[PDB]
Short mmCIF file of C-alpha atoms in Angstrom, two decimals:
data_model
loop_
_atom_site.label_atom_id
_atom_site.label_comp_id
_atom_site.label_asym_id
_atom_site.label_seq_id
_atom_site.Cartn_x
_atom_site.Cartn_y
_atom_site.Cartn_z
CA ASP A 169 -25.64 9.31 9.33
CA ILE A 170 -25.05 5.57 10.94
CA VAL A 171 -21.87 4.87 12.82
CA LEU A 172 -19.77 2.30 12.57
CA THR A 173 -16.88 1.75 15.21
CA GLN A 174 -13.82 -1.39 14.94
CA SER A 175 -12.10 -3.31 17.66
CA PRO A 176 -9.22 -3.38 17.87
CA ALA A 177 -7.61 -1.01 15.63
CA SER A 178 -5.61 -3.65 15.63
CA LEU A 179 -4.88 -7.37 16.13
CA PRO A 180 -1.62 -9.00 16.55
CA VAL A 181 -2.90 -13.42 16.78
CA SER A 182 -0.12 -16.11 16.43
CA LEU A 183 -1.00 -18.55 14.20
CA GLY A 184 -4.09 -21.75 14.60
CA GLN A 185 -5.69 -19.40 17.03
CA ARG A 186 -8.56 -17.69 15.90
CA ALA A 187 -9.04 -13.51 15.83
CA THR A 188 -11.86 -12.16 17.15
CA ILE A 189 -13.20 -9.12 15.64
CA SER A 190 -16.16 -6.80 16.29
CA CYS A 191 -18.00 -3.94 14.92
CA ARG A 192 -20.69 -1.63 16.24
CA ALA A 193 -23.45 0.83 14.82
CA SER A 194 -24.89 3.29 16.25
CA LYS A 195 -28.48 2.31 15.46
CA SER A 196 -29.84 -1.33 14.61
CA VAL A 197 -29.35 -2.53 11.66
CA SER A 198 -31.75 -5.77 12.00
CA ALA A 199 -35.10 -5.82 10.05
CA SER A 200 -37.51 -8.33 10.90
CA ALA A 201 -35.98 -11.36 9.78
CA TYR A 202 -32.50 -9.67 8.14
CA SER A 203 -29.20 -8.19 9.53
CA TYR A 204 -27.59 -5.96 6.82
CA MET A 205 -24.14 -5.72 8.34
CA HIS A 206 -20.96 -7.21 5.99
CA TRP A 207 -17.60 -7.91 6.30
CA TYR A 208 -14.66 -7.57 3.72
CA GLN A 209 -10.90 -8.12 3.46
CA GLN A 210 -8.96 -6.49 1.51
CA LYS A 211 -5.21 -7.23 0.99
CA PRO A 212 -1.18 -4.76 -0.01
CA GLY A 213 -2.32 -3.40 -3.47
CA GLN A 214 -5.72 -5.02 -4.02
CA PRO A 215 -9.57 -4.03 -3.66
CA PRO A 216 -11.01 -5.25 -0.88
CA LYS A 217 -12.98 -8.50 -0.83
CA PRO A 218 -16.48 -9.98 0.28
CA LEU A 219 -15.99 -12.81 2.84
CA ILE A 220 -19.36 -12.58 5.17
CA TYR A 221 -22.87 -11.15 4.19
CA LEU A 222 -25.39 -10.13 5.63
CA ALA A 223 -24.02 -10.82 8.78
CA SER A 224 -23.98 -14.42 8.80
CA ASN A 225 -24.01 -16.06 5.67
CA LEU A 226 -20.41 -16.83 3.47
CA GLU A 227 -19.57 -15.67 0.05
CA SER A 228 -18.93 -18.47 -2.36
CA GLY A 229 -15.01 -19.85 -2.21
CA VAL A 230 -13.97 -18.24 1.32
CA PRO A 231 -12.49 -20.72 3.43
CA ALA A 232 -15.02 -21.96 6.04
CA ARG A 233 -12.51 -20.46 8.37
CA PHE A 234 -14.56 -17.79 8.17
CA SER A 235 -17.80 -16.94 9.95
CA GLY A 236 -20.07 -14.07 11.05
CA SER A 237 -22.88 -13.78 14.23
CA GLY A 238 -24.71 -10.36 15.69
CA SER A 239 -27.39 -8.86 15.44
CA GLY A 240 -29.19 -5.50 15.81
CA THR A 241 -26.17 -3.55 16.54
CA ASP A 242 -23.49 -5.08 17.81
CA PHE A 243 -21.07 -8.02 15.36
CA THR A 244 -18.52 -9.83 15.50
CA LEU A 245 -15.90 -11.38 12.65
CA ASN A 246 -14.37 -15.09 13.81
CA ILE A 247 -11.29 -16.40 11.82
CA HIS A 248 -10.82 -19.67 13.33
CA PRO A 249 -7.57 -21.33 12.45
CA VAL A 250 -5.76 -18.10 11.37
CA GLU A 251 -2.54 -18.45 8.87
CA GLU A 252 -0.31 -16.73 7.27
CA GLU A 253 -2.26 -14.99 3.88
CA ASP A 254 -5.05 -13.68 6.75
CA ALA A 255 -2.76 -11.04 7.37
CA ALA A 256 -4.96 -7.79 6.42
CA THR A 257 -7.13 -5.26 7.42
CA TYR A 258 -10.78 -6.44 7.91
CA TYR A 259 -14.08 -3.73 6.99
CA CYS A 260 -17.29 -4.49 8.79
CA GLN A 261 -20.59 -1.82 6.65
CA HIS A 262 -24.18 -1.50 6.89
CA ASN A 263 -26.81 -2.01 4.15
CA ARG A 264 -29.77 -0.49 6.26
CA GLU A 265 -30.34 3.22 4.92
CA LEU A 266 -28.50 4.77 3.00
CA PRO A 267 -25.48 6.77 2.78
CA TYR A 268 -23.79 3.34 4.12
CA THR A 269 -20.86 3.68 5.67
CA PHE A 270 -17.93 1.31 6.57
CA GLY A 271 -16.04 0.77 9.70
CA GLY A 272 -12.96 1.94 10.89
CA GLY A 273 -10.89 -1.14 9.86
CA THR A 274 -8.82 -4.27 11.93
CA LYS A 275 -5.62 -4.45 10.66
CA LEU A 276 -4.61 -8.49 11.68
CA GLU A 277 -0.99 -9.33 12.28
CA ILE A 278 0.06 -13.03 11.98
CA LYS A 279 2.57 -12.95 15.82
CA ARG A 280 5.39 -14.62 14.80
CA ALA A 281 8.58 -15.80 16.33
CA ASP A 282 10.94 -13.40 17.53
CA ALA A 283 13.64 -12.63 13.64
CA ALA A 284 16.86 -10.76 13.85
CA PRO A 285 17.19 -8.71 11.12
CA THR A 286 19.57 -8.99 8.05
CA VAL A 287 21.62 -5.80 7.66
CA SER A 288 23.52 -3.89 4.76
CA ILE A 289 25.33 -0.21 4.35
CA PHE A 290 25.57 1.07 0.78
CA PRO A 291 27.72 4.16 0.07
CA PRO A 292 25.97 6.98 -2.16
CA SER A 293 27.20 6.17 -5.79
CA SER A 294 28.93 8.34 -7.96
CA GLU A 295 25.84 9.07 -10.77
CA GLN A 296 24.51 10.85 -7.51
CA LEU A 297 27.92 12.91 -6.15
CA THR A 298 28.20 14.23 -10.52
CA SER A 299 24.49 15.82 -8.88
CA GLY A 300 26.11 17.60 -5.95
CA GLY A 301 24.13 14.98 -3.17
CA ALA A 302 24.96 11.93 -1.90
CA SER A 303 22.60 9.29 -0.24
CA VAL A 304 23.31 6.39 1.86
CA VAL A 305 21.48 3.15 2.74
CA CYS A 306 20.81 1.22 4.83
CA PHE A 307 18.70 -1.96 4.36
CA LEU A 308 16.73 -4.20 7.93
CA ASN A 309 15.40 -7.23 5.85
CA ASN A 310 13.27 -9.73 7.06
CA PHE A 311 12.35 -9.13 11.12
CA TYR A 312 10.23 -8.84 13.60
CA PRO A 313 8.18 -7.18 15.48
CA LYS A 314 8.23 -4.80 13.91
CA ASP A 315 9.29 -1.97 15.96
CA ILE A 316 12.88 -1.01 15.23
CA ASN A 317 15.31 1.87 16.14
CA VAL A 318 18.06 2.53 13.52
CA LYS A 319 20.49 5.25 13.72
CA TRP A 320 23.02 6.69 11.93
CA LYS A 321 26.17 8.26 13.28
CA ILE A 322 28.61 10.78 11.00
CA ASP A 323 32.25 10.48 12.08
CA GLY A 324 30.55 9.24 15.49
CA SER A 325 27.97 11.90 15.76
CA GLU A 326 24.02 11.32 15.75
CA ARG A 327 22.47 12.58 12.64
CA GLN A 328 18.43 12.70 12.89
CA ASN A 329 17.89 15.05 10.60
CA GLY A 330 17.77 13.90 6.66
CA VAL A 331 15.58 10.49 7.40
CA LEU A 332 13.11 8.52 5.99
CA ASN A 333 12.51 4.84 6.93
CA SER A 334 10.13 2.64 5.19
CA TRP A 335 8.53 -0.63 5.91
CA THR A 336 7.09 -2.65 4.06
CA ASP A 337 3.65 -4.71 4.06
CA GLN A 338 4.18 -7.70 6.27
CA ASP A 339 4.93 -11.15 3.91
CA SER A 340 2.37 -13.09 3.64
CA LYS A 341 4.28 -16.54 2.78
CA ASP A 342 6.88 -15.66 6.72
CA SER A 343 4.91 -12.74 8.02
CA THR A 344 8.19 -10.81 8.29
CA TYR A 345 8.84 -7.53 7.51
CA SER A 346 11.79 -4.80 6.20
CA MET A 347 12.18 -1.67 6.09
CA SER A 348 14.80 0.86 3.80
CA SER A 349 16.94 3.77 6.30
CA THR A 350 17.62 6.69 3.73
CA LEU A 351 20.43 9.76 4.80
CA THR A 352 20.37 11.99 2.38
CA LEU A 353 23.22 15.02 1.82
CA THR A 354 24.70 17.32 0.38
CA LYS A 355 28.63 16.38 -1.48
CA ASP A 356 30.06 19.13 0.53
CA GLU A 357 28.97 17.61 3.31
CA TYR A 358 29.69 14.15 2.50
CA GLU A 359 32.74 15.11 2.03
CA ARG A 360 34.51 16.29 4.60
CA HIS A 361 33.57 13.28 7.09
CA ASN A 362 34.91 10.25 7.17
CA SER A 363 33.27 7.02 8.87
CA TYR A 364 29.03 6.41 8.13
CA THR A 365 27.31 4.13 10.66
CA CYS A 366 24.06 2.55 10.54
CA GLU A 367 22.82 1.36 14.21
CA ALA A 368 20.29 -0.96 14.31
CA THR A 369 18.37 -2.00 18.23
CA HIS A 370 16.39 -4.28 18.28
CA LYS A 371 14.46 -6.71 20.49
CA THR A 372 15.66 -9.05 19.08
CA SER A 373 19.23 -8.89 20.31
CA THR A 374 20.51 -7.17 23.18
CA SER A 375 23.37 -5.08 21.98
CA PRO A 376 22.55 -2.71 17.92
CA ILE A 377 23.45 -4.50 14.78
CA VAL A 378 26.29 -2.00 13.39
CA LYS A 379 26.93 -1.49 9.47
CA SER A 380 29.73 0.58 8.38
CA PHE A 381 31.70 1.93 5.81
CA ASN A 382 35.16 3.85 5.49
CA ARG A 383 34.90 7.38 2.61
CA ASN A 384 39.13 6.80 1.92
CA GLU A 385 39.14 3.04 2.70
CA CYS A 386 39.95 1.30 -1.03
CA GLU B 19 -18.01 -14.41 -14.56
CA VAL B 20 -18.30 -10.30 -13.91
CA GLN B 21 -15.60 -7.44 -13.92
CA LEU B 22 -15.02 -4.31 -13.53
CA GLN B 23 -11.92 -2.45 -14.56
CA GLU B 24 -11.54 1.38 -12.96
CA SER B 25 -9.33 4.19 -15.66
CA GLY B 26 -8.57 7.93 -15.55
CA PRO B 27 -5.67 9.37 -14.65
CA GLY B 28 -3.35 9.54 -12.13
CA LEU B 29 -3.04 13.84 -11.13
CA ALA B 30 -5.15 16.82 -11.57
CA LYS B 31 -4.47 20.47 -10.37
CA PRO B 32 -6.40 21.86 -8.03
CA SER B 33 -10.20 23.39 -9.32
CA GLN B 34 -9.86 21.17 -12.12
CA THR B 35 -12.87 18.67 -13.02
CA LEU B 36 -11.98 15.11 -12.95
CA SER B 37 -13.34 12.33 -15.31
CA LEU B 38 -13.12 8.29 -13.90
CA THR B 39 -14.35 5.26 -15.94
CA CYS B 40 -15.91 1.71 -14.73
CA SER B 41 -15.84 -0.98 -17.92
CA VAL B 42 -17.76 -3.41 -17.02
CA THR B 43 -17.89 -6.64 -18.63
CA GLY B 44 -19.83 -10.06 -18.18
CA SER B 45 -22.87 -8.40 -17.23
CA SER B 46 -25.55 -5.46 -17.84
CA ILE B 47 -25.82 -2.20 -16.19
CA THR B 48 -29.03 -2.04 -17.37
CA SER B 49 -29.77 -4.99 -14.34
CA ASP B 50 -27.91 -4.16 -11.01
CA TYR B 51 -27.13 -1.45 -8.66
CA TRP B 52 -23.46 0.37 -10.03
CA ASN B 53 -21.60 2.21 -7.24
CA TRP B 54 -18.77 4.54 -6.16
CA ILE B 55 -16.67 4.27 -3.27
CA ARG B 56 -12.37 6.17 -2.68
CA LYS B 57 -9.88 5.20 -0.02
CA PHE B 58 -8.12 8.32 1.74
CA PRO B 59 -4.46 8.06 1.76
CA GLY B 60 -4.82 6.18 5.50
CA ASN B 61 -7.50 3.60 6.20
CA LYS B 62 -10.83 5.28 6.14
CA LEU B 63 -13.22 3.91 3.03
CA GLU B 64 -15.82 6.71 1.84
CA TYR B 65 -19.11 6.00 0.83
CA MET B 66 -20.48 7.94 -2.37
CA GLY B 67 -23.19 6.83 -4.64
CA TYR B 68 -24.62 4.92 -7.50
CA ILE B 69 -26.58 5.17 -10.57
CA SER B 70 -28.97 2.20 -10.52
CA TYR B 71 -30.51 0.00 -13.21
CA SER B 72 -32.88 2.59 -14.53
CA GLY B 73 -30.42 5.47 -14.77
CA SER B 74 -31.63 6.71 -11.43
CA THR B 75 -28.66 8.47 -9.34
CA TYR B 76 -28.00 8.85 -5.46
CA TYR B 77 -25.14 10.70 -4.43
CA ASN B 78 -24.19 10.58 -0.48
CA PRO B 79 -25.32 13.99 0.84
CA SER B 80 -22.66 13.89 3.38
CA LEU B 81 -20.09 14.49 1.09
CA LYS B 82 -17.95 17.37 0.72
CA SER B 83 -17.55 17.34 -2.83
CA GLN B 84 -19.69 18.30 -6.10
CA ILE B 85 -19.83 15.01 -8.15
CA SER B 86 -22.31 13.74 -10.81
CA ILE B 87 -22.66 9.82 -11.90
CA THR B 88 -23.60 9.05 -15.86
CA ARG B 89 -23.00 6.29 -17.64
CA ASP B 90 -23.21 4.28 -21.63
CA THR B 91 -25.13 1.21 -22.28
CA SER B 92 -24.43 0.98 -25.17
CA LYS B 93 -20.44 0.68 -24.38
CA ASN B 94 -21.77 -1.28 -20.72
CA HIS B 95 -19.90 1.96 -18.85
CA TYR B 96 -20.03 4.25 -16.15
CA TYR B 97 -18.52 7.06 -15.61
CA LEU B 98 -18.02 9.67 -12.11
CA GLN B 99 -16.58 13.18 -11.89
CA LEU B 100 -15.40 15.11 -9.09
CA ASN B 101 -16.54 18.89 -9.66
CA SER B 102 -14.08 21.60 -8.94
CA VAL B 103 -11.63 19.22 -7.50
CA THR B 104 -8.82 20.07 -3.98
CA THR B 105 -6.01 18.71 -2.16
CA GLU B 106 -8.29 16.71 -0.01
CA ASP B 107 -10.33 14.13 -3.16
CA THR B 108 -6.67 12.72 -3.58
CA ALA B 109 -7.99 8.77 -2.79
CA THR B 110 -8.05 5.38 -4.54
CA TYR B 111 -11.19 4.97 -6.23
CA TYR B 112 -13.16 1.56 -6.76
CA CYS B 113 -16.11 0.69 -8.46
CA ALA B 114 -18.88 -2.12 -7.01
CA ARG B 115 -21.96 -3.33 -8.09
CA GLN B 116 -24.66 -3.85 -5.53
CA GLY B 117 -26.86 -7.01 -7.09
CA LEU B 118 -31.13 -7.06 -5.89
CA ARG B 119 -30.04 -11.17 -5.11
CA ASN B 120 -26.69 -10.56 -3.32
CA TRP B 121 -27.18 -6.98 -1.42
CA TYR B 122 -24.37 -6.39 -0.76
CA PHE B 123 -20.50 -5.06 -2.90
CA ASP B 124 -20.38 -8.49 -4.60
CA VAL B 125 -17.18 -7.82 -7.25
CA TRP B 126 -14.81 -5.35 -7.48
CA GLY B 127 -12.57 -3.33 -9.34
CA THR B 128 -8.87 -3.15 -8.66
CA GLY B 129 -8.93 0.92 -8.45
CA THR B 130 -7.39 3.91 -9.68
CA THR B 131 -5.14 5.78 -7.64
CA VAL B 132 -6.03 9.90 -7.87
CA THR B 133 -2.79 12.79 -6.62
CA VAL B 134 -4.93 16.20 -6.93
CA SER B 135 -1.89 18.68 -6.28
CA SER B 136 -0.93 22.31 -8.23
CA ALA B 137 2.92 20.92 -7.91
CA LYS B 138 4.89 20.07 -11.20
CA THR B 139 5.54 16.67 -12.34
CA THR B 140 9.29 15.53 -11.44
CA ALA B 141 11.10 13.00 -13.41
CA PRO B 142 13.12 10.59 -10.78
CA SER B 143 17.15 9.83 -10.89
CA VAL B 144 17.46 6.51 -10.91
CA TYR B 145 20.69 5.56 -8.67
CA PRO B 146 22.39 1.61 -8.39
CA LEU B 147 23.22 0.09 -5.30
CA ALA B 148 26.25 -1.73 -4.89
CA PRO B 149 27.53 -3.36 -1.25
CA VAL B 150 30.63 -1.31 -0.19
CA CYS B 151 33.77 -1.56 -2.49
CA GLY B 152 35.44 -3.76 0.29
CA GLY B 153 35.69 -7.50 -1.67
CA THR B 154 34.87 -9.34 1.73
CA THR B 155 31.42 -11.22 0.44
CA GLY B 156 29.31 -13.98 2.80
CA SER B 157 27.11 -17.12 0.74
CA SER B 158 24.48 -14.46 -0.53
CA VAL B 159 24.78 -10.61 -1.71
CA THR B 160 22.10 -7.28 -1.68
CA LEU B 161 22.06 -5.52 -4.63
CA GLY B 162 19.55 -1.75 -4.01
CA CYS B 163 17.83 0.52 -5.94
CA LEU B 164 17.88 3.81 -5.45
CA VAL B 165 14.60 6.02 -7.42
CA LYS B 166 14.90 9.60 -5.71
CA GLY B 167 13.20 12.93 -6.71
CA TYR B 168 9.94 12.57 -8.28
CA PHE B 169 6.28 13.42 -8.83
CA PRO B 170 3.59 12.23 -8.58
CA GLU B 171 2.90 8.95 -7.67
CA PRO B 172 3.19 6.16 -9.20
CA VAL B 173 6.59 3.82 -10.19
CA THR B 174 6.89 0.56 -10.35
CA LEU B 175 10.41 -0.89 -10.79
CA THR B 176 11.11 -4.81 -11.44
CA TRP B 177 14.31 -6.72 -12.23
CA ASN B 178 15.62 -7.61 -15.34
CA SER B 179 12.73 -7.22 -16.37
CA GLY B 180 10.47 -9.25 -14.16
CA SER B 181 12.85 -12.52 -14.63
CA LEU B 182 14.18 -11.87 -10.99
CA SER B 183 11.28 -12.03 -8.06
CA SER B 184 12.73 -14.20 -5.57
CA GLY B 185 14.83 -12.44 -3.17
CA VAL B 186 13.49 -9.15 -4.27
CA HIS B 187 11.97 -6.55 -1.08
CA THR B 188 10.16 -3.06 -2.91
CA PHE B 189 9.74 -0.33 0.03
CA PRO B 190 6.91 2.41 -0.27
CA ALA B 191 7.73 5.74 -1.38
CA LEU B 192 7.70 8.84 0.51
CA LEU B 193 7.42 11.82 0.71
CA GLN B 194 9.91 14.47 1.87
CA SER B 195 9.60 18.14 0.30
CA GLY B 196 7.83 18.07 -2.22
CA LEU B 197 8.87 14.76 -4.03
CA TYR B 198 8.93 11.09 -3.25
CA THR B 199 11.77 8.62 -3.37
CA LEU B 200 12.02 4.84 -2.74
CA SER B 201 14.20 1.67 -2.98
CA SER B 202 14.21 -1.95 -3.94
CA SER B 203 16.83 -4.48 -3.01
CA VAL B 204 17.76 -7.72 -4.29
CA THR B 205 19.16 -10.94 -2.49
CA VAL B 206 21.45 -13.75 -4.98
CA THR B 207 24.17 -15.72 -4.72
CA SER B 208 27.89 -14.77 -4.56
CA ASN B 209 29.13 -16.18 -7.35
CA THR B 210 25.69 -14.93 -10.27
CA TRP B 211 26.59 -11.53 -9.71
CA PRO B 212 28.34 -9.54 -11.07
CA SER B 213 29.00 -11.95 -13.84
CA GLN B 214 25.41 -12.34 -14.16
CA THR B 215 24.31 -8.46 -14.61
CA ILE B 216 21.21 -6.94 -12.66
CA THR B 217 19.59 -4.13 -13.36
CA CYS B 218 16.85 -2.37 -12.52
CA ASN B 219 13.81 -0.99 -14.33
CA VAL B 220 11.90 2.48 -14.04
CA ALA B 221 9.16 3.61 -14.81
CA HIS B 222 7.09 6.78 -14.86
CA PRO B 223 4.68 7.24 -17.07
CA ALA B 224 3.99 10.92 -15.28
CA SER B 225 6.88 12.04 -16.88
CA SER B 226 7.75 9.45 -19.44
CA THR B 227 11.13 8.07 -17.93
CA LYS B 228 11.73 4.75 -18.48
CA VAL B 229 15.33 3.95 -17.21
CA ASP B 230 17.09 0.94 -16.99
CA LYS B 231 20.33 0.98 -14.56
CA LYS B 232 22.72 -2.06 -13.75
CA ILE B 233 24.68 -2.39 -11.07
CA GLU B 234 28.10 -1.87 -11.05
CA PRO B 235 30.53 -2.93 -9.24
CA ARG B 236 32.28 -0.31 -7.35
CA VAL B 237 36.56 0.32 -8.08
CA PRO B 238 38.42 1.65 -5.84
#
């Protein structure tokens, strides 16, 4: 089968600039007067949407910012200028022969002014303690870049087992990320310690952001 | 104005048969090409095959699954059957049309997600997340809702029956030791809560679960 190799896998670009995504095929997809290499855009939770067909033709309704070119085995998709709503994943796909195949995709990240997170900490609910478990939750909302380290501390001792960290997709309006960090314990283990703390070390600050509570302080 | 819409079961057990339906309106399925596509956990899109305007079919030979594509012209629907599914058939499935005057996947459905697993379906426990009991407060308050220990995906979560949409972040579910966990945060002004009640509405169809959990302030 024909293999389509996209590049780069992930592309950060600042607002207003242009993004260049390339797609290379194992074999030529151009026969005589036409080239069979189409592009699609998929946003989170949505299906992929056609942007450009037959190498350089614009789909109806697609903004003029999108353009395509290429022939033979090499093809390129251009977006100039990029905007917030373009945060998405883009795929190339060929039609020259069966079976049709897709490229690996290219995630478009809108470069964003470094922003620090708003951190909140929540102790276990009485309903959960009734069940014999105890989860401590730490929210980190609206920051950038995406990478960020969260460290849990029980009575000043680091804890990395039993932690679940989940990121949202890049927001389409403000281009920020948010993440949730959950530390799950047993009720009896939660009740033999006093201090609980999530520390957020991020590129935005020299020292980490710290939120904490004490079990018996109320 | 052509529309496609996938439908089918959300959970199937290994070695069972899985049948999906693509309902088509706004255009007859006897004039164009009609395809099936799936997206694996990850980012890999795979072409599966089509059924043509004349009822002729084509199946991607590189597939490891055994599939069958059929149609019903009286309903303007067409179908995809996977025989003896495996865990590797877990994916999101799309139907899309390829036009004679377009020659690309010009119309897509929204997609339907399928999980193939033998694990029993389990209902979620919904827990409120209220501010640490200390009374100090800033200019805003962040609340939360924790949905833990369910299977399979998906769940839906709203705040105050959807009336509360601004300042809401819902985090994708994660699988740990066989069960899913997800959470959601909502931010309001200091004087809104608790005088105004805030509730997370959680639904998990696979277990017949529907839960409304009010966020109560913490007592000392």
